[PDB]
Amino acid sequence: IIRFENDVEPEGYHYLYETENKILAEEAGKVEKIDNENEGIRVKGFYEFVAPDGITYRVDYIADENGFQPSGAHLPK
Structure with missing residues (x-):
């Protein structure tokens, strides 16, 4: 594979x-x-x-205490 790493901490994690x-x-x-x-x-x-x-595509997403709050190109300014 090209890349593969996964960190893990009691205060959080990353992938x-x-x-x-x-x-x-x-x-x-x-x-x-x-x-x-x-x-x-x-x-x-x-x-x-x-x-x-060559077309770029990204979609951010975050979940708060209020619920699911979509983000990324899914919201134009």
């Missing part, structure tokens, strides 16, 4: 890998509280990749 299919994706999340109640922790992740046509 980074690149396939030979011209794909680039990753994932990360940082925890805080534990047991009992919660409401405060969140996770963020995104992925990007350029098609042979």
Whole structure:
């Protein structure tokens, strides 16, 4: 494979890998509280990749305590 790595920590984790299919994706999340109640922790992740046509494409996504909050090219300014 082109690339392959995965870190892991009690305060969070990370993911980074690149396939030979011209794909680039990753994932990360940082925890805080534990047991009992919660409401405060969140996770963020995104992925990007350029098609042979040279066309770029990326889609970010993050989940907060309020719920799923989409992002990336899915929201034009």
